[PDB]
């Protein structure tokens, strides 16, 4: 689990969104595994606006932050699970790292701020849903 809290927005994995998230919906995109809801309180996270390919992510199944090299946001096949029909997830970045059910929502960050959240795992791979192109999160 986990979310990004920027301004009056809460960014979560679409597959983990709560009823309150759907009842206060700002934007959602199944192809990206992202959903954004509105918040009453202002958040403290800042979004990175860059093309970094190195950063650090939080892995809840290890209680650890790991430094990683990750690919550029791309259209990558994701295998079927309880949340999606095996398919093509867009704006996804891959790295070598631990990710097991329970880890989605962990933040990936670089020197500029938050880059994205854990969205995939397995195989010593971790996939991140990018948020750097969502410029409206800053206003
Ligand atoms: N974004 C996706 O399509 C996810 C949806 C869940 C399935 N996805 C996964 O990679 C797996 C999974 C199942 C439960 N949790 N996780 C994860 F992400 F933490 F690793 C490994 C099988 C793709
Ligand atoms: Zn950066």
């Amino acid at each position: 689990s986990g979310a990004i809290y920027v301004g009056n927005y809460r960014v979560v994995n679409r597959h983990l969104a709560t009823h309150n998230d759907w009842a206060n919906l700002v934007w959602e995109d199944s192809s990206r595994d992202l959903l954004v809801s509105s918040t009453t309180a202002q958040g403290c996270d800042t979004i990175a606006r860059c093309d970094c390919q190195t950063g650090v992510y939080y892995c809840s199944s290890r209680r650890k932050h790991y430094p990683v090299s990750f690919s550029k946001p791309s259209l990558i096949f994701v295998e079927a699970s309880e949340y999606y029909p095996a398919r093509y997830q867009s704006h996804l970045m891959l790295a070598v790292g631990h990710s097991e059910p329970g880890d989605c929502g962990g933040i990936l960050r670089c020197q500029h701020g938050v880059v994205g959240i854990v969205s995939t795992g397995g195989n010593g791979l971790v996939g991140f849903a990018d948020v750097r192109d969502l410029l409206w999160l800053d206003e």
Side-chain angles (χ1 to χ4, degrees):
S1 64
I4 305 166
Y5 291 97
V6 53
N8 287 267
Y9 299 120
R10 167 175 142 94
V11 188
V12 286
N13 293 91
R14 187 184 186 273
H15 74 273
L16 300 177
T18 67
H19 167 76
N20 188 69
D21 289 321
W22 280 105
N24 291 281
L25 182 68
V26 171
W27 170 82
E28 54 83 26
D29 184 321
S30 170
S31 77
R32 293 179 69 149
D33 186 42
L34 285 181
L35 182 147
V36 178
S37 59
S38 60
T39 64
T40 59
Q42 288 181 281
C44 294
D45 293 320
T46 287
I47 309 297
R49 302 296 180 198
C50 70
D51 64 351
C52 287
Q53 287 189 249
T54 65
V56 173
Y57 82 105
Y58 183 62
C59 176
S60 69
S61 65
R62 294 285 181 268
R63 288 199 188 98
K64 200 142 179 36
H65 293 259
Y66 291 105
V68 287
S69 295
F70 52 96
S71 63
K72 293 192 177 194
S74 318
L75 186 66
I76 303 194
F77 195 70
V78 182
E79 290 300 310
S81 49
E82 4 129 19
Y83 297 102
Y84 290 108
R87 78 209 200 288
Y88 278 99
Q89 179 169 316
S90 63
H91 299 264
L92 186 69
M93 299 172 296
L94 297 184
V96 173
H98 187 74
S99 178
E100 84 175 72
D103 291 322
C104 290
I107 282 174
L108 170 69
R109 67 180 78 230
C110 69
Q111 74 182 88
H112 305 109
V114 176
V115 171
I117 51 174
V118 173
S119 177
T120 79
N123 293 350
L125 297 164
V126 58
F128 309 103
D130 183 52
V131 298
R132 295 178 288 187
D133 65 315
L134 303 176
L135 312 189
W136 55 263
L137 288 171
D138 300 343
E139 57 196 29

